[PDB]
Design a protein that fits this description.
part of a larger assembly, 3 chains, A mainly beta (about 130), B alpha+beta (about 140), C alpha+beta (about 55), A: mainly beta, 8 strands, B: two-stranded antiparallel ribbon, elongated, DNA-directed RNA polymerase activity (chain A)
C-alpha cells in the first residue's frame, strides 16, 4: 500500500530563520539508502530544526487495500501532489500545489512511480 | 583544536561588529571574544554574508560549537552556523603560558672556549610569542 | 513599555510579569515584535478567540 518509506535526517535549511514567515526548503539525507531530498515545509506551522529525525512515506491512496482517489492517525503531515517529471541516480519532481519536492536517490529504489500520477506525502517526526 | 578562529556561515547584512560582539558576549562568557572581522566587498559600506571570529580559549570555541550544533544561537531571526577557518585573524598562540611580556632580550656569541657569553646589545620590555602550529 | 496599552503588569513581590485587564490588547503587534527582536520568538503567543465576543 506504501511505495516508499524511509527514515530521513535533515542536514541544512535554505533560509536558516525562525520567524521569516516564508516557506523553508529542507535538505534531508536518507539512511541505509543514500537518498537526497528537497521539500518546502512551513516552519511557522510545522517546526523543523537541523539535526532532527523524521520518517517519510508515499502512497497512491489513503484508503486501505484499494479505493484510489485511514492513515490520518499515524502520520501528521499528510499532503497531496502530482509527479510531473521522472527523467534526470534517478530523481523525482512532485509539486504539492506549488511546493516543489525533489527526491534524488538510486535508480533501483525509484522504479514503481508512473508519470503524471497523484500521490500523497506522509511524514512524522518520530 | 589547532586554531581558535571560527567562521560564521550567515549573518544579517544590516548588523555591525559591535552588535555581534555583544551578542556573543551575552551568550558566552564575558570578554571571551578576542577579534571579530566582517569582510566587505567595498571599502566601508558593503559587508559580506559571513564573518570570522577568534576566541581567547579553546574551551570557549568548543562551547560555541556545541551551542551552534544545537541551534541555540539565534541573532536577529538568523541561525548562526559555525565552521573551522583557514587562518587566524592575528597570529596569536592560544595559551596563557606561551605569552611572555616585559623580558630582557640580548644577542651575542660565545667569546672563548669557556662557558662565557658576551652581550652585544640589550633590549628590555620585549614580547615573545611561541607558536607551535606555525613552527616559529 | 513596548505595549501601547496597559495589558501586562509588573508584579513586585514575585519580580515577574502578570496579565491584568486582558481585554485591552487592541490586536497590535507590539509586544510580539519586541520579543522577537530581543531573541524570544515564542515568548508571548496571542490568538483571537472565535466563539467569544
Amino acid at each position: 500500500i506504501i511505495m516508499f518509506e524511509d527514515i530521513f535526517v535533515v542536514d541544512k535549511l535554505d533560509p536558516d530563520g525562525k520567524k521569516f514567515d516564508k516557506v523553508t526548503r529542507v535538505e534531508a539525507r536518507s539512511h541505509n539508502l543514500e537518498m537526497f531530498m528537497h521539500l518546502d515545509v512551513n516552519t511557522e506551522v510545522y517546526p523543523l530544526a537541523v539535526g532532527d529525525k523524521f520518517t517519510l512515506a508515499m502512497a497512491p491512496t489513503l484508503n486501505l487495500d484499494g479505493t484510489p482517489d485511514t492513515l490520518a492517525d499515524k502520520y501528521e503531515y499528510i499532503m497531496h501532489g502530482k509527479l510531473y517529471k521522472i527523467s534526470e541516480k534517478a530523481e523525482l519532481y512532485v509539486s504539492f500545489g506549488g511546493l516543489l519536492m525533489l527526491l534524488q536517490g538510486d535508480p533501483a529504489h525509484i522504479s514503481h512511480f508512473e508519470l503524471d500520477q497523484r500521490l500523497f506525502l506522509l511524514m512524522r517526526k518520530l | 583544536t589547532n586554531r581558535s578562529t571560527v567562521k560564521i556561515s550567515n549573518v544579517p547584512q544590516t548588523i555591525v561588529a559591535d552588535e555581534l560582539l555583544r551578542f556573543l558576549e551575552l551568550h558566552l562568557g564575558e570578554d571571551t571574544v578576542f577579534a571579530l572581522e566582517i569582510p566587505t566587498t567595498r571599502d566601508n559600506w558593503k559587508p559580506r554574508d559571513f564573518a570570522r571570529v577568534q576566541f581567547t580559549t579553546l574551551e570557549v570555541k568548543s562551547r560555541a560549537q556545541l551551542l551552534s550544533s544545537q541551534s541555540k544561537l539565534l541573532f536577529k531571526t538568523h541561525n548562526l552556523r559555525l565552521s573551522e577557518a583557514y587562518d587566524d585573524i592575528i597570529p596569536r598562540p592560544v595559551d596563557p603560558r606561551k605569552r611572555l611580556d616585559d623580558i630582557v632580550l640580548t644577542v651575542g656569541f660565545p667569546e672563548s672556549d669557556e662557558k662565557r657569553f658576551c652581550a652585544l646589545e640589550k633590549w628590555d620590555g620585549v614580547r615573545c610569542w611561541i607558536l607551535t602550529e606555525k613552527r616559529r | 513599555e513596548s505595549s501601547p496599552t496597559k495589558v501586562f503588569g509588573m508584579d513586585p513581590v514575585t519580580r515577574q510579569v502578570v496579565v491584568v485587564d486582558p481585554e485591552a490588547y487592541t490586536y497590535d503587534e507590539e509586544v510580539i515584535k519586541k520579543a522577537e527582536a530581543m531573541g524570544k520568538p515564542g515568548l508571548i503567543e496571542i490568538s483571537p478567540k472565535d466563539d467569544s465576543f
